Write a structure and sequence with these properties.
Blueprint (H helix, E strand, L loop, with lengths): L15
């Protein structure tokens, strides 16, 4: 749900 690291549930980051 953030921008850093691979990608989360929707956003391109976990951090």
């Amino acid at each position: 749900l953030v921008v850093i690291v691979q990608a989360d549930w929707n956003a391109p980051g976990f951090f």
